[PDB]
């Protein structure tokens, strides 16, 4: 049993932190093992609905997932859920200049 399907529903998980700029879009993209299973989308502890802010985009087997104004208040911590499996990710949205 090598590699089988014992014990794995994501065939790839979301990076271990993301970065991206203020007032704009990150990107989070999942895939399944199989399309059978269903994919659901929370930040912090509670569902995300579709909407402009949210873009779900499905193909095949892999679902990604945009989020329109990106703001340092918006940084919050996402889980997918797929099956019998589930991963997080943290997201870092800058704010502001650095140097100048």
Known sequence: ????????????????????????????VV????????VKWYKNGQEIRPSTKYI????????????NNCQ????????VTAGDEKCSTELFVRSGPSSG
């Open 72 to 79: 340092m208040t918006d940084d919050s911590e996402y889980y």
């Open 31 to 38: 895939e399944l093992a199989d399309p059978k299973l269903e």
């Open 56 to 67: 779900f985009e499905h193909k095949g087997c892999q679902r990604i997932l945009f989020i």
């Open 1 to 28: 049993g090598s590699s089988g399907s014992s014990g794995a529903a994501f065939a790839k998980i979301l990076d271990p932190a993301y970065q991206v700029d203020k007032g704009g879009r990150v990107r989070f």
